[PDB]
Amino acid sequence: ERIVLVDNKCKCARITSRIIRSSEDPNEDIVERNIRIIVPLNNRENISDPTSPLRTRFVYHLSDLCKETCYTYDRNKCYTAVVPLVYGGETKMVETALTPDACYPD
Amino acid sequence: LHRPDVYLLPPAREQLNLRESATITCLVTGFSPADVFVQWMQRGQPLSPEKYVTSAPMPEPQAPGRYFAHSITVSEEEWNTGETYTCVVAHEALPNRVTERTVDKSTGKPTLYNVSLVMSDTAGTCY
Amino acid sequence: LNLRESATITCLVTGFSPADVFVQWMQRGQPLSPEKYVTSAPMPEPQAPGRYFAHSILTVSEEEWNTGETYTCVVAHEALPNRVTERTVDKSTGKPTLYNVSLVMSDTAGTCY
Amino acid sequence: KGVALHRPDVYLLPPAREQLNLRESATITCLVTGFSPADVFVQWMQRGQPLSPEKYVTSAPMPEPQAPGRYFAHSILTVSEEEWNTGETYTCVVAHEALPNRVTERTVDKSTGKPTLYNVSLVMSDTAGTCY
């Protein structure tokens, strides 16, 4: 029986715990904590604005996230800007899509 | 008048190895004024009064105004599943007079971790 | 511990008949003043009729607790063969807590969520 | 009038490192591939400032070998090497009816181009955590 404590996807962490029943021994059951993280390795300090430097120093407080510039993107949430593209005579002041398959309307 | 503090103390292993029983407590302290309620809840059903003993709000030597109290038994082979033995505290100086905290058998000191973290370039969207 | 202001240590005595036990705290060879600790009065046990239980609470700052110290709890009751027993604590009284940390670097290896 | 609006894929390629040895100039490019139909407008923005059209020359779409329906084209810009030595990232825009927004943007500079050094200094602490 694995119990998921927090699955905060902004930091992309899957903190979760399990109990392991031992052999024919007194029931002083052990406690285990599997942790797995994901780092973009290619993103920047600001995940949306294309001006911040590259991600160099990473901080993972395993208590703060369980309640704030979260590193990885999300399945649906994203930030996007607007270009001055005109597209010839027919003016096209069109909103853009910074993240493909993630900035789609939802 | 101020914020009570609640902590959980799991039974010591030396008590459990006797294979006779276990004792679980959640200490409440650093609260003012006195006359603070405590209730024991398990699996959503109320716990019978006799299986727990509640102390009185005595003062503590360090903080004069603040008060502290105590509450406390299960069979040895019952806590192995935990059931987390929830205790809720009802104090006047609380948002909703509820500051529930609970700890199960799994909750506690971890013997080992085997923390296996992965990392790779093809990321950035929490795939 | 995680708020870093002070800590409390508790000594539990259980399953004694009759009443009138004695408890105090021994500090690495020298006693402490009585007001630094609070001893709960004897209380009848619900399950066991003739047995009793009691608590002793001692509060001391975390900063000095970061140093080892002994902080021994000593109890005297007639039922004991020598009429006196005691125990001790420390921050090192925990467990080894084996680690099995594994880390993978290659982006080529297949990853799962 | 009979062509599916396939997703116009856009890639950015930076000047080769060997080109940055004689300290003469550089050459960025953006290529669009796998789309239909033609008549796609492409240009570069420099931190939101429009770039002079004469500074760059784009290509004309031609049929893709593998997929006849898909087309592809290139746009090439030439800049000085010290401009990249100072950073000064740019972005290449697309104008094709396939995308609902009809526009996508990228970003190319020294940092994003083949980082030879990996300064990873991750910190992990408080393994117990407060997660309740």
Side-chain angles (χ1 to χ4, degrees), chain D residues 37-70:
Chain D
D39 186 71
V40 176
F41 164 72
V42 162
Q43 76 175 340
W44 283 278
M45 295 298 102
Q46 176 177 11
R47 271 84 74 203
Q49 166 256 328
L51 278 189
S52 67
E54 79 281 0
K55 201 185 188 300
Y56 65 92
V57 170
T58 179
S59 162
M62 72 291 291
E64 205 275 324
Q66 301 330 102
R70 303 304 195 280

Side-chain angles (χ1 to χ4, degrees), chain C residues 1 6 12 14 17-18 35 42 48 53 56 65 68-69 88 92-93 97 101:
Chain C
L1 265 176
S6 56
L12 181 62
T14 314
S17 65
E35 75 269 22
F53 78 109
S56 295
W65 162 261
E69 267 82 6
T88 175
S92 49
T93 48
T97 64
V101 171

Side-chain angles (χ1 to χ4, degrees), chain A residues 5-6 15 33 35 37 41 50 54-64 66-67 83-87 92 94-98 103-104, chain D residues 7 39 41 43 45 48 93-95 97 100-105 107 111 115 118-132:
Chain A
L5 277 299
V6 173
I15 190 167
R33 303 272 293 274
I35 311 294
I37 318 295
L41 196 148
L54 203 81
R55 276 306 299 200
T56 288
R57 206 289 290 281
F58 314 86
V59 167
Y60 309 89
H61 270 162
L62 201 55
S63 67
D64 188 17
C66 292
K67 64 196 173 68
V83 293
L85 178 138
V86 286
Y87 180 46
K92 297 264 190 169
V94 189
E95 192 270 335
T96 61
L98 188 153
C103 278
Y104 264 115
Chain D
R7 295 278 109 183
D39 186 71
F41 164 72
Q43 76 175 340
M45 295 298 102
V93 73
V94 72
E97 277 69 21
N101 289 124
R102 282 91 70 191
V103 163
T104 47
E105 290 292 357
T107 285
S111 52
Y118 273 29
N119 213 354
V120 175
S121 313
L122 61 84
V123 63
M124 202 46 187
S125 185
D126 196 45
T127 186
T130 61
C131 317
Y132 301 97

Side-chain angles (χ1 to χ4, degrees), chain B residues 63-81:
Chain B
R66 316 296 289 280
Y67 277 44
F68 89 103
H70 186 273
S71 188
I72 186 66
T73 187
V74 308
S75 66
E76 211 283 337
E77 277 76 8
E78 163 62 29
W79 184 64
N80 48 26
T81 66

Side-chain angles (χ1 to χ4, degrees), chain A residues 10-22:
Chain A
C10 84
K11 297 211 76 65
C12 204
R14 59 138 191 79
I15 190 167
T16 187
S17 165
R18 203 165 54 83
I19 190 167
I20 297 90
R21 284 317 189 125
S22 77

Side-chain angles (χ1 to χ4, degrees), chain D residues 71-119:
Chain D
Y71 297 150
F72 63 106
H74 294 88
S75 200
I76 298 98
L77 180 61
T78 66
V79 300
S80 72
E81 75 284 354
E82 69 275 16
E83 203 149 357
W84 267 66
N85 298 145
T86 53
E88 313 191 47
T89 186
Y90 316 117
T91 180
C92 182
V93 73
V94 72
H96 186 223
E97 277 69 21
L99 310 176
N101 289 124
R102 282 91 70 191
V103 163
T104 47
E105 290 292 357
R106 297 301 175 281
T107 285
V108 285
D109 76 323
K110 307 297 271 300
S111 52
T112 199
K114 201 255 186 180
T116 69
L117 188 153
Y118 273 29
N119 213 354

